[PDB]
Design a protein around this ligand. Structure first.
Ligand code: SAH
Ligand code: K
Ligand code: K
Ligand code: K
Ligand code: MG
Ligand code: MG
Ligand code: MG
Ligand code: MG
Ligand code: MG
Ligand code: MG
Ligand code: MG
Ligand code: MG
Ligand code: MG
Ligand code: MG
Ligand code: MG
Ligand code: MG
Ligand code: MG
Ligand code: MG
Ligand code: MG
Lengths: 108, 72, 191, 323
RNA sequence: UAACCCAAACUAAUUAUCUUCGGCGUAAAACGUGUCAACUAUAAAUAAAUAAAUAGAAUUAAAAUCCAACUUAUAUGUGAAAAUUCAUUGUUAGGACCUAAACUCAAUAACGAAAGUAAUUCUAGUCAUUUAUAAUACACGACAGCUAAGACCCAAACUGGGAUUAGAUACCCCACUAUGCUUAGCCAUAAACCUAAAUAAUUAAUUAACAAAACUAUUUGCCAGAGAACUACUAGCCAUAGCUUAAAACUCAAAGGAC
RNA sequence: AUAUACCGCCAUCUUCAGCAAACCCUAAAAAGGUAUUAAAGUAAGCAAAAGAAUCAAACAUAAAAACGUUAGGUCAAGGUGUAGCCA
RNA sequence: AGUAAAUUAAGAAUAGAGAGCUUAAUUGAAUUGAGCAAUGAAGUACGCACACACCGCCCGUCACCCUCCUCAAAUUAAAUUAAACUU
């Protein structure tokens, strides 16, 4: 672009930073609604443990539960955090182990 | 130089043309109603002007033109 | 500004042209195949086809050869360029073809001189006149035919061996009834 | 009830007239035979079928016309002997009607096993008690190996998925005997996912079951219709009068090919190309045609009519005159 | 289990800190074309001067078509067939027609803003703004398509008939429409592509690859990962299954160019 | 148990003509490297060739045939890695 | 080509056991192109969206579950305004 064209337009317009599943917040608190299994998109093979939750904002999201074995059930309370599960498409939230009803993984 | 990008657009346009053909009658009714709302919005915007100016009736000998109807 | 020839100038430059001031080893009077050779022999076959038709149907060669009015089937030079094989169209009459063959062959030396003299082709190798073997056989199959005397006046169709399959079924019924290339080893000291 | 399909084309083509002797190699229910005997009451006709039930129908219908219809029982191959036992009375037959397929009575009756939709024994055998040792479809599926069984589906049913379907049958028969029509249909429909059970839409624009090709394959192999048909057309020509009109109805391509190739001097023996460098054009024959094809042009019944008799949708009527 | 990093902290999530002098033949990107403004730059005083621009009128050589005379028994068609046809076919130095399209020249490279334009003749006609730079204005814009009235030799979507094929809604054969033509108006889209914006310099103090050698300056336009997307919504339009204008959610870690 | 850990001994393309190593060159090289009236290729190994065998000579026949291809065949010729049995 | 074919003998291994195997000898032919339409291989040219390498890659209709978005008949919901002047 010419110097006249750079002057008439100025600095590049910056698209706004749209928020993610946590809505620009470190964590959210949600109530478990259902516990189910999700299948990782190929080339991976597993039965990943997930749960649906109703977040404090009022929306409902799918959250991956990390660790080997959880005791979560419906009506439990959990603290979710950000971070996508790479193989699980659409799962953009995770549960925090050791907060509210969710507990630390039982060591073997 | 392959034509792969042209083939993606080729399929999108083909499928879109068949979608319009299926729902041609529905799309016609959407348009006639979108134009009617477009006309009411035009009339209301003209009524706002003379009422704000303080007139209680539209200017003498004025009839809002119907500009979106099948006049041509 | 706008040139129609530009569209095809670069395409025809690799198909019908080669670069450099090199003439083939064959083209001399006295290996690895090359593309230039295909060009250097394709153009000669066309020039000789054009130039050897300007002798048969023209008066330079002779009066009898001019009267012969010999049209040519094809011209094809040997890859080695030792000699040429000028095929000529052959009428049905075998006897006339035999006479025409001799006539043309006698003037082969003079015909070469005519082209070499005109400067159309500088160094033309010896020429030959050949009859298409296909044409000769078809004529011979007619000569011998005239001389010849005719004397005084289900499972395999479908593709399944239904019989074998029946035996197989009846027989059954009888029975029924990237890591080690890293510098780890060098950086540890295991030499 | 099943009206004889395209009978009007056959009736016009045959032109049954007094003083003419006709033959029917597939009497079956007799609908076609009755139509020939209605246009001309003085016509002479001979009937034949492989089903003893069908033969009894002809004998019962022989009361309606004592001598105009002559009933016989046997296969196409055995037709020549049966007409030879009668003598030279058929002799120069003016027309031989070689309708093909399953009889309306045979497939409507679930006991005969021809219908996959209904539940019956897996007999699928046009022959009745005339020959009790003739293997049924149950024996065929339970005995043949994948290589043999797959060929039946591929060759006679035109089955696209022959290895998968055959293997499922071999596994299923080992678990339990395959004795019922619906049992076999589920086994064939189990080689694929549940989605493919009823997915294969047809040219009719009407969906069909996925095991229809297996029933067609077993139907033709149990009764060896195609091989016996090859002998029936050859024996009709021998028994057909010079200038006599032959009329056939082909409801699938395999039978149509033999009728299509026979009536044009082509041979079923001809080898098969497989979609590579087929010389449809070259970018001849031992002898010329031996028939005057009154209607070389073929057609299926009218699509409106097809709805009334979907079994006859693919009926191709091939008419010819002996040379 | 042993090592490594940080250390009264340590790790996770969230958020913030880095922001245009780069590009536009083939990777995103020069607008289908031209003209008029205001700025920013530039500095010269011309142009045009019969090869196919454009519009109008007149004109016609070849080949068809129709009519007539005579005339084979078939004609037509394919790789081979079938259907079609004998109301045909071949000849005419016979008549009519002026529908449609313009061989050779053309191995030419002209004209025009582009689109486009080449049978002949005549009439009207292209030309000077220093130069570049324009949209919300104006005038154009292949083919197909729409509207009304005509034309109709041949071609031909569709459709019907015949073949082929497992099928053949196709490729091949035959017939025949819309349509291609004229006159009015609309439509405004092309791989509208030299895939090259225009203009003035330079050819050396210069090989990413390939294409079409490199590169400077001036002005405007345009581009900012891929797909979603020649899409949704909005506005304008003689457009109504339309065109121009033109997003986001969401998905992905690539997509793409050359060798 | 595993010939899909192997040695050993073989099949196959095969009586096919290539394989591997040391150098050299390129307006960069992923690779490629020939022209004999010669233009960037060069000097050695294995195979081939030669030689030997079928008791003169030739021809012929045998033998020979690299590196790779088919995770080819063989844990049951023997041996052996890993795992398993030891009333 | 002393080949095929035919006809003999011996040997290995066994106590014995093959119509198998190895080897020696006898008699003793016919035929070999006016070759490359095809099949396969090699060479050269060209194309490639293939590299698992054409038994490749790959495009649409159809079928469940899940994610986001748009349209839309109506209904209701809250929201959001601004002044005109007399005495
Ligand atoms: N090879 C064969 N020999 C004799 N009859 C046969 C046969 N294959 C089939 N058929 C019989 O031919 C008939 C064909 S279907 C029925 C058609 C008959 N015209 C009718 O009106 O019913 C059936 O009865 C069938 O059993
Ligand atoms: K994995
Ligand atoms: K172009
Ligand atoms: K080994
Ligand atoms: Mg798409
Ligand atoms: Mg681009
Ligand atoms: Mg058709
Ligand atoms: Mg027309
Ligand atoms: Mg455009
Ligand atoms: Mg153009
Ligand atoms: Mg478009
Ligand atoms: Mg649009
Ligand atoms: Mg829109
Ligand atoms: Mg192995
Ligand atoms: Mg040797
Ligand atoms: Mg193995
Ligand atoms: Mg051992
Ligand atoms: Mg073992
Ligand atoms: Mg012994």
């Amino acid at each position: 672009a010419t110097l006249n064209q750079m002057h008439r337009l100025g600095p590049r317009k910056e698209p706004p930073k749209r928020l993610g599943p946590t809505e620009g917040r470190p964590q959210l608190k949600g109530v478990v609604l259902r516990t189910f299994i999700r299948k990782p998109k190929k080339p991976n093979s597993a039965n990943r443990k997930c749960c649906r939750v109703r977040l404090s904002t009022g929306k409902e999201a799918v959250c991956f539960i990390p660790g080997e074995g959880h005791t979560l059930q419906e009506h439990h309370v959990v603290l979710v955090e950000g971070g996508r599960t790479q193989d699980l498409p659409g799962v953009k939230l995770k549960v925090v182990r050791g907060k509210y009803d969710c507990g630390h993984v039982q060591k073997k | 130089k392959n034509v792969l990008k042209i083939r993606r657009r080729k399929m999108n346009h083909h499928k879109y043309r068949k979608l319009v053909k299926r729902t041609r009658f529905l799309r016609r009714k959407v348009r006639e109603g979108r134009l009617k709302k477009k006309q009411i919005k035009f009339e209301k915007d003209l009524k706002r002007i003379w009422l704000k100016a303080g007139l209680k009736e539209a200017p003498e000998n004025w009839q809002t033109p119907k500009i979106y109807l099948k006049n041509k | 500004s706008k040139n129609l020839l530009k569209k095809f100038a670069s395409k025809t430059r690799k198909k019908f042209w080669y670069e450099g001031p090199s003439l083939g080893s064959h083209l001399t009077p006295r290996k690895k195949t090359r593309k230039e050779d295909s060009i250097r022999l394709r153009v000669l076959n066309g020039l000789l086809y054009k130039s050897l038709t300007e002798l048969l149907c023209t008066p330079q060669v002779s009066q009898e050869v001019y009267d012969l009015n010999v049209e040519l089937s094809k011209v094809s030079v040997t890859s080695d360029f030792s000699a040429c094989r000028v095929y000529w169209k052959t009428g049905v009459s075998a006897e006339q073809n035999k006479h025409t063959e001799s006539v043309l062959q006698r003037s082969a030396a003079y015909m070469r001189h005519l082209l070499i003299s005109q400067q159309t082709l500088r160094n033309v190798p010896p020429i030959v006149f050949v009859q298409d073997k296909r044409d000769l056989v078809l004529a011979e199959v007619d000569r011998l035919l005239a001389e010849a005397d005719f004397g005084p006046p289900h499972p395999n169709l479908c593709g399944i061996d239904h019989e074998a399959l029946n035996k197989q079924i009846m027989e059954y019924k009888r029975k029924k009834e990237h890591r080690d290339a890293s510098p780890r080893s060098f950086l540890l000291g295991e030499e | 009830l099943h009206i004889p399909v395209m009978v009007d084309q056959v009736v016009h083509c045959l032109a049954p007239q007094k003083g003419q002797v006709f033959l029917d190699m597939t009497f079956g229910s007799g609908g076609h035979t009755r139509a020939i005997l209605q246009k001309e009451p003085d016509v002479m006709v001979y009937a034949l079928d492989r089903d003893p039930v069908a033969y009894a129908i002809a004998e019962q219908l022989s009361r309606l016309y004592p001598t105009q219809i002559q009933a016989l029982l046997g296969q196409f191959s055995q037709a020549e002997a049966l007409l030879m036992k009668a003598g030279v009375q058929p002799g120069t037959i003016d027309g031989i009607l070689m309708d093909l397929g399953c009889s309306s009575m045979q497939l409507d009756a679930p006991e005969r096993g021809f219908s996959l939709r209904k539940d019956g024994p897996l007999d699928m055998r046009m022959d009745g008690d005339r020959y009790p040792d003739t293997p049924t479809a149950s024996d065929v599926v339970n005995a043949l190996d994948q290589q043999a069984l797959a060929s039946i589906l591929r060759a006679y049913g035109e089955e696209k998925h022959a290895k998968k379907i055959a293997s499922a049958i071999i596994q299923a028969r080992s678990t339990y005997p395959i004795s019922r029509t619906q049992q076999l249909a589920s086994i064939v429909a189990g080689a694929f996912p549940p989605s493919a059970v009823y997915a294969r839409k047809d040219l009719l624009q009407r969906s069909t079951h996925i095991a229809t090709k297996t029933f067609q394959a077993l139907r033709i192999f149990v009764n060896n219709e195609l091989n016996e048909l090859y002998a029936g057309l050859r024996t009709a020509e021998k028994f057909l009068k010079t200038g006599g009109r032959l009329v056939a109805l082909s409801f699938h391509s395999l039978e149509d090919r033999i009728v299509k190739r026979f009536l044009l001097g082509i041979s079923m023996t001809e080898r098969f190309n497989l979609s590579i460098r087929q010389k449809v054009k070259q970018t001849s024959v031992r002898a010329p045609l031996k028939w005057e094809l009154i209607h070389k042009k073929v057609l299926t019944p009218e699509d409106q009519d097809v709805q009334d008799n979907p079994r006859g949708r693919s009926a191709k009527l091939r008419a010819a005159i002996k040379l």
